[PDB]
């Protein structure tokens, strides 16, 4: 809730990288279910979360 | 300036009798004057420059021996190219053919702005690149 | 009158006085070292005055391009329409050989945070987003701690420094992509997308982060702004040659006795910089093979050129290279120069974003050819083929990374072609 309020209203998708990383810190890695959760919390299509996870190397998909 | 005697003929040009076309393929045929549509699989527009005149498709059946595609239409493969619509109608009228003319369909100009992909308060913003 | 030799900067003129973390980085240590002093007067002086001080200062970007900062920051000095205005501070230091921005963040955080406010006031910005790469976790935490102290002291936030100007400072962490150092790829990452650069136009000053006006300034370019305004542009412009003024942070790394980060005056001769601060090359200056003046993105130069070349934008351009990020990578005669540069091409193959054809397909192509030059499994006719391939990437790509992959190869072919052909001759003899 603090992360999503660092960005202008109407641009919640800007929080994908922080939240998707916060998911990994809690869980140690990012399963497909973790990505789908961040998609619905931020209300962005799940594919747009898959793109970020696969693009960046600090996200562990295994 | 031509030092040769000329005459005046007020009748429309009609060569149907001096072309050798059987009457079946003058009166019963429907020419189609059109600019070919762009092949949608490709982005090139170099086949949409000239007018074409095609005729009405007729029966194609199966050769009993080999299964090939037989035909009894001598005009099945006839395609003529014209620079302008008027040149196409002029050629069909003097040959006695009945024609339909379809007006050219040019794609209307559009407003392309690469910056609209990153709009602050509009839906044109793209979710990915 | 105008100087003729440069170097030997005095500690009385060093902007980053805590470059080694020998004093208190937290607040009340920065203030004791001249930070956050008389900031309200600078803000109340006016955006035009602040920009005028940076234009006269001759400061140029320390991110790798070296554009005149004063000219760039004036693009946001325009009437404000309905949209907000932001300042993005590029702390994504990822250029191989570059470590200067890491030290500013972890030891002088309050210089960066003050620079955000001064830079923002010049641009009329409402907030600053500091993009710092995700591997700098501890450094990012130090920056976050400093920002909290600034807010509690009234230095930033509502009525910053009592100036009546509102300014927020947000820290945003990257997720491990070197391409996100690019000014437009960095913006895309902040917007929560893949770090793929945009095309220009539109420029960030007209359409940027969230579609609003934006300026991307490197950590060093911003951290020096408050000092320039306090000490004026004349003091900063008095260093270095004309159009190359200022004090620059250098990162001497590789085959040297004392690899270190040090602040030194612009136009300092490269030989003096290596010997005086880094303790010379490993094995003696005569054991020097080549130097990469400004990180991997710049082409290398051989020993014959390092003896009389100054470290500034203009001096290194005449040498067929660039200043870049002022990171000096030294290679001695025991180095495998072909393998040293081949690994740099392999770096760019791994950091290419894949967006555009000449770098998605070309930099990978140059990688495979280079991996065969290391072993000599090629014929000499391929060297000219590799020269043309690089020229088809350079200037045909969306962003400058494609240029950064071509330049290392061009330098190798330019100054070390005999080593390439010798390697292939050896391989041919054995497998005859
Ligand atoms: C592939 C690539 C990586 C870059 N990485 C950085 C970086 O890590 N830090 C930085 O300040 N500029 C980096 N830049 C340069 C930026 O594009 C831009 O010049 C800089 O953010 C502007 O800051 P300046 O005003 O100090 O020059 C990079 C450019 C490219 C093409
Ligand atoms: S040059 Fe490479 S990194 Fe830059 S936009 Fe093109 S593909 Fe992406």
Swiss-Prot record, chain A:
<comment type="function">
    <text>Core subunit of the mitochondrial membrane respiratory chain NADH dehydrogenase (Complex I) which catalyzes electron transfer from NADH through the respiratory chain, using ubiquinone as an electron acceptor. Parts of the peripheral arm of the enzyme, where the electrons from NADH are accepted by flavin mononucleotide (FMN) and then passed along a chain of iron-sulfur clusters by electron tunnelling to the final acceptor ubiquinone. Contains one iron-sulfur cluster.</text>
</comment>
<comment type="subunit">
    <text>Core subunit of respiratory chain NADH dehydrogenase (Complex I) which is composed of 45 different subunits. This is a component of the flavoprotein-sulfur (FP) fragment of the enzyme.</text>
</comment>
<protein>
    <recommendedName>
        <fullName>NADH dehydrogenase [ubiquinone] flavoprotein 2, mitochondrial</fullName>
    </recommendedName>
</protein>
<comment type="similarity">
    <text>Belongs to the complex I 24 kDa subunit family.</text>
</comment>
UniProtKB/Swiss-Prot annotation, chain B:
<keyword id="KW-0597">Phosphoprotein</keyword>
<comment type="similarity">
    <text>Belongs to the complex I NDUFS4 subunit family.</text>
</comment>
<comment type="function">
    <text>Accessory subunit of the mitochondrial membrane respiratory chain NADH dehydrogenase (Complex I), that is believed not to be involved in catalysis. Complex I functions in the transfer of electrons from NADH to the respiratory chain. The immediate electron acceptor for the enzyme is believed to be ubiquinone.</text>
</comment>
<feature type="modified residue" description="Phosphoserine">
    <location>
        <position position="127"/>
    </location>
</feature>
<keyword id="KW-0999">Mitochondrion inner membrane</keyword>
<keyword id="KW-0813">Transport</keyword>
<dbReference type="GO" id="GO:0022900">
    <property type="term" value="P:electron transport chain"/>
</dbReference>
<feature type="region of interest" description="Disordered">
    <location>
        <begin position="103"/>
        <end position="129"/>
    </location>
</feature>
<dbReference type="GO" id="GO:0007420">
    <property type="term" value="P:brain development"/>
</dbReference>
<keyword id="KW-0249">Electron transport</keyword>
<keyword id="KW-0496">Mitochondrion</keyword>
<dbReference type="GO" id="GO:0045271">
    <property type="term" value="C:respiratory chain complex I"/>
</dbReference>
<keyword id="KW-0472">Membrane</keyword>
<comment type="subunit">
    <text>Mammalian complex I is composed of 45 different subunits. This is a component of the iron-sulfur (IP) fragment of the enzyme. Interacts with BCAP31 and TOMM40; the interaction mediates its translocation to the mitochondria; the interaction with BCAP31 is direct.</text>
</comment>
<dbReference type="GO" id="GO:0008137">
    <property type="term" value="F:NADH dehydrogenase (ubiquinone) activity"/>
</dbReference>
From Swiss-Prot, chain C:
<feature type="binding site">
    <location>
        <position position="356"/>
    </location>
    <ligand>
        <name>[4Fe-4S] cluster</name>
    </ligand>
</feature>
<keyword id="KW-0408">Iron</keyword>
<feature type="binding site">
    <location>
        <position position="353"/>
    </location>
    <ligand>
        <name>[4Fe-4S] cluster</name>
    </ligand>
</feature>
<dbReference type="GO" id="GO:0006120">
    <property type="term" value="P:mitochondrial electron transport, NADH to ubiquinone"/>
</dbReference>
<keyword id="KW-0520">NAD</keyword>
<keyword id="KW-0809">Transit peptide</keyword>
<feature type="binding site">
    <location>
        <position position="359"/>
    </location>
    <ligand>
        <name>[4Fe-4S] cluster</name>
    </ligand>
</feature>
<keyword id="KW-0560">Oxidoreductase</keyword>
<keyword id="KW-0830">Ubiquinone</keyword>
<dbReference type="GO" id="GO:0051539">
    <property type="term" value="F:4 iron, 4 sulfur cluster binding"/>
</dbReference>
<dbReference type="GO" id="GO:0045271">
    <property type="term" value="C:respiratory chain complex I"/>
</dbReference>
<keyword id="KW-0496">Mitochondrion</keyword>
<feature type="binding site">
    <location>
        <begin position="61"/>
        <end position="70"/>
    </location>
    <ligand>
        <name>NADH</name>
    </ligand>
</feature>
<keyword id="KW-0007">Acetylation</keyword>
<dbReference type="InterPro" id="IPR011537">
    <property type="entry name" value="NADH-UbQ_OxRdtase_suF"/>
</dbReference>
């Amino acid at each position: 809730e603090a992360i999503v309020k660092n960005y202008p209203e109407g641009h919640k998708a800007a929080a994908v990288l922080p939240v998707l990383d916060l998911a990994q810190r809690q869980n140690g890695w990012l399963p497909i279910s973790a990505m789908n959760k961040v998609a619905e919390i931020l209300q962005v299509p799940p594919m747009r979360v898959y793109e970020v996870a696969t693009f960046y190397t600090m996200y562990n998909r295994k | 300036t031509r030092d040769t005697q000329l005459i005046t003929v007020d009748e429309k040009l009609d060569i149907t009798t001096i072309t050798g076309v059987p009457e079946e393929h003058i009166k019963t045929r429907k020419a189609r004057i059109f600019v070919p549509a762009r092949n949608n699989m490709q982005s090139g527009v170099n086949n949409t420059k000239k007018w074409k005149m095609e005729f009405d498709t007729r029966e194609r059946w199966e050769n009993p021996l080999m299964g090939w595609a037989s035909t009894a239409d001598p005009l099945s493969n006839l395609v003529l190219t014209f620079s302008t619509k008027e040149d196409a109608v002029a050629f069909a009228e003097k040959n006695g053919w009945s024609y339909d003319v379809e007006e050219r369909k040019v794609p209307k100009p559009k407003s392309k702005s690469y910056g609209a992909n990153f709009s602050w308060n509009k839906r044109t913003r793209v979710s990915t690149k | 009158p105008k100087k003729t030799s440069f170097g030997s900067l005095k500690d009385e003129d060093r902007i980053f006085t805590n470059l080694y973390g020998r004093h208190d980085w937290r607040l009340k240590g920065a203030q004791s070292r001249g930070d956050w002093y008389k900031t309200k007067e600078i803000l109340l002086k006016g955006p035009d005055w602040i920009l005028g001080e940076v234009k006269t200062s001759g400061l140029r970007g320390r991110g790798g391009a070296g554009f005149p900062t004063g000219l760039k920051w004036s693009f946001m000095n325009k009437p404000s329409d309905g949209r907000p205005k932001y300042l993005v501070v590029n702390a994504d230091e990822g250029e191989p050989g570059t470590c200067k921005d890491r030290e500013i963040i972890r030891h002088d955080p309050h210089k960066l945070v003050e620079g955000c406010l001064v830079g923002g006031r010049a641009m009329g910005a409402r907030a600053a987003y500091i993009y710092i790469r995700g591997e700098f976790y501890n450094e990012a935490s130090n920056l976050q701690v400093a920002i909290r102290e600034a807010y509690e002291a009234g230095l930033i936030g509502k009525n910053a420094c009592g100036s009546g100007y509102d300014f927020d400072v947000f820290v945003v962490r990257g997720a491990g992509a070197y391409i996100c150092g690019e000014e437009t790829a960095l913006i895309e990452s902040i917007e929560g997308k893949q770090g793929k650069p945009r095309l220009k136009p539109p420029f960030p000053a007209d359409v940027g982060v969230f579609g609003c006006p934006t300026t991307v300034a490197n950590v060093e370019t911003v951290a020096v702004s408050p000092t320039i305004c306090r000490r004026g542009g004349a003091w900063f412009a008095s260093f270095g040659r004309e159009r190359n003024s200022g004090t620059k942070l250098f990162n001497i790394s590789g085959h040297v006795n004392n690899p270190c980060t040090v602040e030194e005056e612009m136009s300092v001769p490269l030989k003096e910089l290596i010997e005086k601060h880094a303790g010379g090359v490993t094995g003696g200056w005569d054991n020097l093979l080549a130097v990469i003046p400004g990180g991997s993105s710049t082409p290398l130069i051989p020993k014959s050129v390092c003896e009389t070349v100054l470290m500034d934008f203009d001096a290194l351009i005449q040498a067929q290279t660039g200043l870049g990020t002022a990171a000096v990578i030294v290679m001695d005669r025991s180095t495998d120069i072909v393998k040293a540069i081949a690994r740099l091409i392999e770096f760019y193959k791994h950091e290419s974003c894949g967006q555009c054809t000449p770098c998605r397909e070309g930099v990978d192509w140059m990688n495979k050819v280079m991996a065969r030059f290391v072993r000599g499994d090629a014929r000499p006719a391929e060297i000219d083929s590799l020269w043309e391939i690089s020229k088809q990437i350079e200037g045909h790509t969306i962003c400058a990374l494609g240029d950064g992959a071509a330049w290392p190869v061009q330098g190798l072919i330019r100054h070390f072609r005999p080593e390439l052909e010798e390697r292939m001759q050896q391989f041919a003899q054995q497998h005859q």
